[model samples]
Target: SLTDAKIRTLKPSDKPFKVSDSHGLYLLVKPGGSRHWYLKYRISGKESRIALGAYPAISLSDARQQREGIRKMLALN
Candidate 1:
């Protein structure tokens, strides 16, 4: 439900989520019991994903900064 520009324009959710954030940058709560940052990006004219890393270990500000960086990259490319 997240479009490229649309997701980038938004902020992080308050209560958190099973798959929070946008632009393929989702926070997934692993079934084995762990949190992860999933960054979905399109490259080489093909869609792909890059895991930003894990939550708590990564932090919210870091995630936002990472997402912003991705936006910059997409805009330039």
Candidate 2:
């Protein structure tokens, strides 16, 4: 699990990196100091990713809510 405080305090390194929340959801912090939310999942034996939204605009709880919806859809497919 990730906290709002933690997310807010994240610093960018020389290269982009990820800070995972859970269930394949993570925040990708780039060198440019941009934080982007993403969801990782596999379908039909292939790995894939989906961009959720940027930080601040999309809070941690909001990201989890979106993740739940996507999980439900994936389960049905």
Candidate 3:
């Protein structure tokens, strides 16, 4: 599970890395010291990815809401 405390503790790396929150949700850590959120999904057997905006500004709670909305949209399609 990912918490605000843990996210804050994550340091930059030589290369990019991702921290997951299950259900295809993740935090992408870039070498330039930027963290972005993304969601992986499969639509009609086609894989896709959704960028859920950046951290702190986007917030964890907001990310969850956005993910839920995307899930609903996928189910309808």
Best candidate (score: TM-score):
2
Would you list the clashing residue pairs of candidate 3?
A: none
Worst 10 residues of 3 by lDDT: 56-65
Candidate 2: which stretches are off by over 4 Å? none
Residue 18 in candidate 2, Cα distance off native in Å: 0.3
Judged by whole-model lDDT over C-alpha atoms, candidate 1 comes out at 0.66
lDDT of each: 0.66, 0.91, 0.88
Clashing pairs in 1: none
- Superposed by TM-score, candidate 1 places the C-alpha of residue 52 at a distance from the truth, in angstroms, of 1.0
RMSD of 1: 8.0
Whole-model alpha-carbon lDDT for candidate 3 = 0.88
Error of 1 at 58 (Å): 0.9
TM-score of 3: 0.92
> Which ranges of candidate 1 are over 4 A from the true structure?
1-18
For every model shown, what is its TM-score relative to the native structure?
0.64, 0.93, 0.92
Q: Is candidate 1 or candidate 2 better by lDDT?
A: 2
Scored by lDDT, the top model is 2
Deviation of model 2 at 48, angstroms: 0.6
Per-residue alpha-carbon lDDT of candidate 3 for residues 22-69, written as tens digits (9 for 90 to 100): 688889999997888999999999998999999988987778789999
The stretch of ten residues in a row with the least summed lDDT in candidate 1 is: 1-10
Model 2, range 1-77, lDDT digits (tens) per residue?
88888987776589999999999999999898788899999997899999999997998999999999999999977
